[PDB]
Design an enzyme around this catalytic site. Structure first.
Site: not given
Ligand SMILES: O=C(Nc1cccc(Nc2nccc(Nc3cccc(C(F)(F)F)c3)n2)c1)C1CC1
Length: 256
Positions: A130, A87, A135
């Site tokens: 949750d 994402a 999330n």
């Molecule tokens: O940082 C950027 N984008 C970005 C930040 C954080 C996450 C994403 N994408 C993404 N895609 C699929 C899955 C996830 N998972 C995820 C993202 C962030 C945290 C966690 C946690 F906390 F579970 F570990 C899971 N993230 C994308 C950029 C500035 C716009």
């Protein structure tokens, strides 16, 4: 049969519950995805393998534009690896602290997308339990996506505090109406910049949630007040259906 050798790893996206999530590219196809890494020892210690299993089972089988796809999984000596839809635009959590608070149009749009997603979940006898901004992810067009299914129980009926309903913190019976409560808290937080029961202390937040004691700042419009007050009822039965939320005049007027 996937292995770590199949992927090129990139920047860390987040530092997570049981391990980091990384940007990754699958070598054969050049497919960009997110690799969630979870430590087995920490999963054992916490004793959450069932919830992980449910998560995996649920997210791999569900198909909704507002739910992050789970493509597969694998493991090794120390870790479990989740293969996730990437994402691009990050969490609503980061988006919220950057913008401070959201306007009514952005909020109603997010609420609509979440309600649609939860409506789908509920129809498959899956209750999230949750739901919270960290999330919630944003896709390439800024569309809201439920990131995962958390470490909650997901059965139709079962028995930070900020997002949990009174029936869940009081150890009472809880059902699909949990996600309606969470929707009310999110709607409030989106508009105000902080969740309605926020406190400096767990014990205080607990009291606020149980009493359902919150107040609106003056800038919160009456249409917004009406939806939120409907969603944040102490008695779950009194909370509207997701169907009613989608038809609410304030949603209709403001959602894209
Ligand atoms: O940082 C950027 N984008 C970005 C930040 C954080 C996450 C994403 N994408 C993404 N895609 C699929 C899955 C996830 N998972 C995820 C993202 C962030 C945290 C966690 C946690 F906390 F579970 F570990 C899971 N993230 C994308 C950029 C500035 C716009």
């Amino acid at each position: 049969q996937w292995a770590l050798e199949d992927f090129e790893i990139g920047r860390p996206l987040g530092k997570g519950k049981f391990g980091n999530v990384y940007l990754a590219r699958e070598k054969q196809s050049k497919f960009i995805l997110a690799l969630k890494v979870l430590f087995k020892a920490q999963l054992e210690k916490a004793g959450v393998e069932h919830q992980l299993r449910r998560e995996v089972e649920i997210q791999s089988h569900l198909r909704h534009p507002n739910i992050l796809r789970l493509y597969g999984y694998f493991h090794d000596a120390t870790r479990v690896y989740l293969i996730l839809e990437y994402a691009p635009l990050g969490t609503v959590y980061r988006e919220l602290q950057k913008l401070s608070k959201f306007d009514e149009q952005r909020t109603a749009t997010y609420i609509t997308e979440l309600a649609n997603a939860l409506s789908y979940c509920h129809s498959k006898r899956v209750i999230h339990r949750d739901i919270k901004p960290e999330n919630l992810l944003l896709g390439s067009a800024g569309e809201l996506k439920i990131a995962d299914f958390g470490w909650s129980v997901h059965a139709p009926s079962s028995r930070t505090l900020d997002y949990l309903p009174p029936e869940m913190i009081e150890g009472r019976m809880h059902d699909e109406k949990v996600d309606l409560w969470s929707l009310g808290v999110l709607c409030y937080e989106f508009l105000v910049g902080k969740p309605p029961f926020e406190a400096n202390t767990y014990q205080e937040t607990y009291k606020r949630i149980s009493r359902v004691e919150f107040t609106f700042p003056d800038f919160v419009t009456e249409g917004a007040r009406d939806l939120i007050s409907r969603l944040l009822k102490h008695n779950p039965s009194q909370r509207p259906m997701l169907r009613e939320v989608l038809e609410h005049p304030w949603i209709t007027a403001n959602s894209s």
